[PDB]
């Protein structure tokens, strides 16, 4: 930063380490002043690694004579002085970070706040900031999981995370708070840092336990509160690594996780596309989610889910592994939820399906086939349409439905022009066809 | 064999060649290839009816006839008409400023923009300017800011700033476009300000643009007192740049560098915040950046470990990189002389001593900052 | 004061036409024109009684006096 | 085996093919011996859904000849002056362009005579600049293989009349190669851009002919010394040299042109000229002493025979603080007066004759 | 910028009387009334 004007490298060579066995246990303070003298003289010298020595040293000397409380006001001093060299101070915080980790004791954690309070004065970026985030990380482990911790290194990450990260460091530092993120329960903020940190891929094409480990932290955060096609969509971003990675296990349970995911998802143009998509895998066929898939996606059946829950609902109670299911619908309270969340995304299926198929069906009939009433039918079919998702009319007091756009007059007769000239093209078409035929069956 | 090998001469022989039968039909297509007029369709009469400009020429109106595509014709599209044919026969797109287009997109081989020393400072006020409003939108989504615009460089005539501009484009080397500010005279009165806003229209195409354009000075001015009409083209040029990268439409991921070496002479109404939202000035370069300048430019030379590069710098001072390849050069024909293969310490000491009376003759090394 | 923001409001005040017109643009190889878009422009105006022409950029292209024609 | 067929169709398909293209070739030859329309190329790079081309014609017309079906776009550079079918609306093929009206021939010496024996005085200075000059360029395949590439800028800075004009035609005439001359004082010009596009123009003209030699005098009147007043700040002839700053490594590659500036005073420049890769071989031209300046008017005059036996010690005594130039005042003086003084006294008055 | 044409005819008429090849049969006077040549005045001690 600065040229340096006077060393001292021979004067500290000569008394350090006699300073050092004269003060051996701590008890002179008188040592200490010195030295601060000493690198006082060489820090307006302007020389950097004689105040970054007696640095090291001076800490170096209150960890042998562990003198707890003494080192907190010392560091301050140090790092308040007058900021001394910014080379120096990112060193002595350097052994203090490698210090603090090896002894356990109770007040460490007032040692780590320390030097966090003596780096977050500012320079994080420059000179030195993965001390402040293995401190924070230190702090994690040593409050074993909170939320306030949490919260602290919710709140750090961001500044080192953008100025200067690294392709597994940081990365696993961000895992390692979104869990924790996670843990607290806390859905807005957990949802702001994951798709704040999501966009930074083109790495896992490389991961061992990373990007499954990120996902299957995002698993439940997403599916807490309403979703259902991301779910699928990274459930099916997991399937691909045992692709590389062929173990049978989690591979058979993650297609049947994503199975089931990508047809509770609820209907629309891009869930036909990745069900279709799905469907047809080789490696899909020999588990049963493959006839579960097969039957519950096209040529618009029935789906009777007081049927399906013994026709296809057997990864309830026993399939090949039957985890993902019993983790979907064999659990209590999220898992009747889910139960639920099957029990009407098949009644929407079954609207849909109905709605290309029946122009007008009687009411008792549409109830029976959402095996439900008339009133909760009708609440459904309201649900629907305010959707626009199906055209739909309903006599209340008549209790019957229609499907049909009333055709205007205009494009009806369109149509049957269009039919005319359809049958005009087919006449000259089938009189061609059969007068080239006549000639050919009469060259005799 | 012999019937085996004489063949594989005579078919090699050709292949590329013998590809000519359809050169000679292709230039003889040419030879009855009707020529059609070229226009731009102003305005669409009717669906049928487009009032189409000749370049040059009246505005006619054309039609197509059965398939042309009507609907994806627009006022201001490019449109190819015959005056015998009567129609469209086919559309075209657009252009592409091709005399700008060469001498933006033949950047040379350049090296990395590590290899200049001191200037770390404008290293990342240039990562900060270009790569960041492009890389992380989402930020700045949250900020909920516009990116900066542009950022001047401006010092002695040696700083690295050419070094810098040749770097940058050869980061990208397909997207930059690179502008010197003088070639806009010509010998017509037009074709000064449509070429301005043909690459600014080439910068609307392309989002992430970056324009670099030197010697601001040699457009700018400060005030032109008895104008005469050289003087005049020059004020309503600049007025024209001025109200197409400002005006009222502005660009998007657009960024133009540029430096000069008089901050002074510049017009006041082009430095004000919002057409140039950053200025920084090259300084000189430091001590030990000199020093690191002196390592790179000797670094592929015939020397031994006696260099005392400490008695380099405590003598060379105020001395660009420039005066370091020359004391380097200098260093090189002096090993040239008695024909020495490697470089002693002496032949440095002897262009530290001719470079430095070189330089005691010339005065005002450096305009003042502003 | 914004010299146009009293000809973008006006118009609506009391509601009329607004044209920017823009005299460099005018100026250009559509000098020929140049007469035909006036009559143009002016018959928009005549077509709607409540308008009003705003032209910019006069002083620096359009007409200047004290420089010889160029 | 297979060969005897292939051949059979091969020189035939070798000679039949060349021989239709001769016949096209004539075709348009024949077009692009007729020719009318300059080519003001406004390219599209119109990749067909590779490029394509708009030519502003000399009747005022335009022509967007398509995907320019006879010449490659890496030839056809935009520009004008190339080739354009008057019938067919095609470019037909380059041709020369125009050298910006004073620089189609401003001073252009196609090739000088003047020979390294008649100057001399400073002979160490130039050996120095042929070393750095003309080796570069009969020996220019030297520095290829060695991997160093030769500085380009050479200033030569001294009193007028040491030679600087001469030796440097010289050095041209023995580079054997173009040599183009650029009246540096008159460079500074009322329109705009004019200097800027004069310079840019000998610089095109000098790449197009050969590894030439730009001799660009008066370089203290392009370049000021930045000693800025309001009564002259060099606003506008900084315009032009900056442009000559970025022609200066223009011919970086392959290393060509070489750039020669001569000055009276090197001290009335900015740190911008003298750059490593820009002007770096500033070459001092003292005034010569008195056995060179009796030895420069002696190989003046060599080519007259009037007096013999002149020694010229007593010229060398009276040519105190002159010039080459006024070396050669002095003897062609004599060279006026010798007729019907004569020997060691018909030199004095000619420097007294100019003031 | 004063006299600018002047100087374009400095340049032409010093092209067309440097003479290059020295030729006895051609001759030029240039005559005026005050020594206010410009800058050739030290060139043509050479040529005038
Ligand atoms: N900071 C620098 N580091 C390395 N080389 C430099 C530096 N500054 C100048 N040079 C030298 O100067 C030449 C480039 O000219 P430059 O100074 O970039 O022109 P300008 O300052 O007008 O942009 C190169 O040959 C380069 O070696
Ligand atoms: N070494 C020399 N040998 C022969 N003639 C010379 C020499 N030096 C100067 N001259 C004379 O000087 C004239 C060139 O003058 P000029 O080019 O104005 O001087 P400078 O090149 O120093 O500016 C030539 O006509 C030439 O006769």
Redesign the pocket.
């Known amino acids: 930063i600065v040229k340096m004007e006077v060393d001292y490298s021979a004067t500290v060579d000569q008394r350090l380490p006699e300073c050092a066995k004269l003060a051996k246990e701590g008890r002179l303070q008188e040592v200490i002043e010195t030295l601060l003298s000493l690198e006082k003289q060489t820090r307006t010298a302007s020389d950097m690694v004689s105040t970054s020595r007696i640095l090291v040293a001076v800490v170096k000397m209150c960890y042998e004579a562990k003198e707890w409380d003494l080192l907190n006001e010392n560091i301050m001093l140090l790092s308040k002085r007058r900021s001394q060299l910014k080379q120096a101070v990112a060193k002595m915080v350097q052994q203090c970070c490698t210090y603090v980790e090896e002894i356990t004791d109770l007040p460490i954690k007032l040692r780590l706040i320390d030097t966090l309070r003596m780096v977050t004065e500012g320079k994080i970026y420059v000179e030195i900031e993965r001390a402040r985030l293995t401190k924070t990380l230190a702090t994690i482990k040593e409050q074993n999981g909170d939320v306030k911790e949490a919260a602290s290194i919710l709140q750090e990450l961001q500044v080192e995370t953008y100025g200067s990260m690294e392709k597994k460091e940081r990365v696993e530092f961000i895992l390692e708070q979104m869990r924790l993120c996670l843990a607290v329960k806390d859905y807005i903020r957990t949802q702001i840092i994951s798709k704040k940190i999501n966009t930074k891929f083109f790495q896992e094409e490389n991961t061992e336990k990373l990007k499954l480990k990120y996902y299957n932290l995002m698993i439940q955060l997403d599916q807490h509160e309403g979703s259902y096609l991301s779910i699928c969509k990274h459930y099916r971003a997991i399937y691909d690594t045992p692709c590389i990675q062929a173990e049978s296990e989690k591979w058979q349970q993650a297609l049947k996780s994503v199975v089931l995911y990508v047809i509770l998802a609820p209907f629309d143009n891009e869930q036909s596309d990745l069900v279709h998509r799905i469907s047809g895998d080789k490696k899909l066929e020999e588990i049963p989610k493959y006839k579960d898939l097969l039957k519950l996606f096209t040529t618009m059946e029935l789906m009777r889910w007081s049927t399906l829950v013994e026709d296809y609902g057997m990864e309830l109670r026993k399939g090949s592994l039957e985890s993902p299911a019993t983790d979907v619908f064999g659990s209590t309270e999220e898992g009747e939820k889910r139960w639920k969340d099957l029990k009407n995304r098949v009644v929407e299926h079954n609207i849909r399906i109905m709605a290309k198929y029946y122009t007008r069906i009687t009411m008792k009939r549409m109830a029976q086939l959402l095996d439900l009433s008339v009133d909760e039918s009708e609440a459904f079919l309201s649900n629907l349409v305010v959707n626009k998702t199906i055209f739909a009319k309903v006599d209340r007091l008549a209790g019957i439905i229609n499907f049909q756009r009333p055709k205007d007059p205009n494009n009806l007769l369109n149509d049957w022009s269009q039919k005319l000239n359809s049958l005009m093209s087919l006449v000259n078409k089938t009189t061609h066809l059969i007068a080239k035929e006549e000639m050919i069956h009469n060259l005799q | 064999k012999e019937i085996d090998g004489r063949l594989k001469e005579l078919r090699e022989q050709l292949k590329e060649l013998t590809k000519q039968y359809e050169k000679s039909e292709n230039d003889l297509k040419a030879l009855q290839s009707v020529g059609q007029i070229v226009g731009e369709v102003l305005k669409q009469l009717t669906e049928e009816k487009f009032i189409v400009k000749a370049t040059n020429g009246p505005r006619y109106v054309v039609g197509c006839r059965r398939q042309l595509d009507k609907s994806k014709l627009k006022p201001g599209t490019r449109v190819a008409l015959d005056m015998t044919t009567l129609t469209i026969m086919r559309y075209l797109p657009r252009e592409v400023d091709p005399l700008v287009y060469n001498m933006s997109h033949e950047d040379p081989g350049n090296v990395s923009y590590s290899?200049?020393?001191?200037?770390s400072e404008q290293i990342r006020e240039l990562r900060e300017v270009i790569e960041l409003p492009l890389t992380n939108p989402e930020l700045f989504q949250r900020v909920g800011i516009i990116p900066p615009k542009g950022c001047l460089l401006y010092?002695?005539?040696?700083?690295?700033?050419?070094?810098?501009?040749?770097a940058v484009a050869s980061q990208l080397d397909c997207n930059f476009l690179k502008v010197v500010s003088s070639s806009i005279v010509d010998k017509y009165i037009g074709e000064s300000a449509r070429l301005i806003r043909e690459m600014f229209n080439y910068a609307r195409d392309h989002q992430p643009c970056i324009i670099f354009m030197?010697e601001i000075d040699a457009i700018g001015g400060r005030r032109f007192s008895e104008g005469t009409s050289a003087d005049r083209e020059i004020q309503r040029t600049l007025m024209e740049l001025l109200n197409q990268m400002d005006g009222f439409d502005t660009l998007h991921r657009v960024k133009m560098i540029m430096?000069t070496?008089r901050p002074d002479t510049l017009d006041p109404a082009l430095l004000r915040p919002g057409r140039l939202d950053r200025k920084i000035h090259?300084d000189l370069?430091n001590e030990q950046?000199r020093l690191?300048?002196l390592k790179?430019?000797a670094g592929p030379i015939t020397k031994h470990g006696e260099i005392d590069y400490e008695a380099i710098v405590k003598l060379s001072d105020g001395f660009?990189?420039?005066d370091?390849?020359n004391v380097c050069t200098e260093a090189g024909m002096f090993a040239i002389r008695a024909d020495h293969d490697f470089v002693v310490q002496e032949d440095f000491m002897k262009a530290v001593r001719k470079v430095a009376d070189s330089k005691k003759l010339e005065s005002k090394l450096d305009y003042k900052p502003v | 004061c914004g010299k146009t923001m009293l000809a973008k409001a006006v118009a609506h005040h009391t509601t009329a036409a607004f044209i920017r017109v823009v005299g460099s643009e005018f100026v250009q190889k559509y000098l020929g024109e140049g007469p035909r878009m006036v009559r143009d422009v002016f018959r928009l105006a005549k077509e709607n009684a409540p308008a009003i022409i705003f032209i910019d950029e006069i002083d620096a292209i359009a007409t200047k006096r004290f420089d010889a024609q160029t | 085996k297979i060969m005897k067929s292939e051949v059979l169709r091969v020189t035939h398909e070798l000679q039949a093919m060349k021989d239709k293209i001769k016949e096209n070739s004539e075709k348009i030859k024949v077009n692009k011996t007729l020719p009318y329309l300059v080519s003001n190329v406004i390219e599209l790079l119109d990749v067909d859904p590779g490029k394509c081309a708009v030519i502003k014609t000399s009747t005022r017309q335009t022509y967007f000849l398509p995907v320019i079906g006879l010449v490659d776009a890496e030839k056809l550079k935009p520009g004008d002056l190339v080739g354009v079918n008057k019938d067919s609306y095609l470019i037909l093929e380059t041709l020369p362009t125009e050298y910006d009206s004073r620089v189609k021939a401003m001073e252009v010496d196609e090739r000088p005579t003047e020979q390294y024996s008649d100057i001399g005085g400073l002979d160490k200075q130039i050996q120095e600049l042929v070393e750095a000059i003309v080796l570069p360029m009969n020996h220019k395949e030297k520095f290829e293989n060695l991997g160093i590439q030769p500085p380009k800028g050479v200033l030569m800075y001294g009193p007028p009349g040491t030679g600087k004009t001469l030796l440097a035609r010289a050095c041209a005439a023995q580079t054997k190669a173009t040599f183009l001359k650029l009246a540096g004082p008159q460079l500074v010009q009322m329109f705009i851009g004019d200097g800027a596009k004069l310079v840019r123009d000998a610089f095109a003209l000098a790449k197009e002919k050969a590894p030439s030699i730009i001799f660009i005098d008066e370089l203290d009147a392009i370049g000021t010394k930045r000693f800025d007043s309001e009564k002259a700040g060099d606003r506008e002839v900084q315009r032009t040299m900056?442009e000559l700053?970025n022609q200066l490594?223009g011919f970086q590659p392959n290393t060509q042109v070489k750039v020669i500036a001569a000055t009276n005073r090197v001290d009335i420049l900015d740190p911008?000229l003298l750059?490593?890769?820009?002007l770096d071989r500033k070459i001092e031209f003292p005034m010569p002493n008195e056995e060179a300046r009796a030895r420069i008017m002696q190989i003046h005059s060599r080519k007259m025979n009037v007096s013999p036996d002149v020694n010229y010690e007593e010229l060398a005594r009276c040519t105190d603080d002159f010039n080459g130039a006024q070396c050669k005042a002095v003897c062609v003086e004599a060279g006026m007066i010798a007729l019907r003084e004569l020997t060691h006294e018909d030199y004095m008055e000619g420097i007294l004759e100019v003031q | 910028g004063g006299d600018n044409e002047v100087q374009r005819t400095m340049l032409e008429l010093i092209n067309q009387l440097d003479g290059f090849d020295p030729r006895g049969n051609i001759k030029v006077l240039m005559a005026t009334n005050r020594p206010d040549t410009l800058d050739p005045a030290l060139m043509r001690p050479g040529r005038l």
């Open positions: 290899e200049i020393g001191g200037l010092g002695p005539p040696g700083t690295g700033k050419t070094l810098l501009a040749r030197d430096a070496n090259i370069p950046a690191d300048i790179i430019h660009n990189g420039a370091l390849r | 900056l700053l490594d911008a750059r490593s890769g820009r």
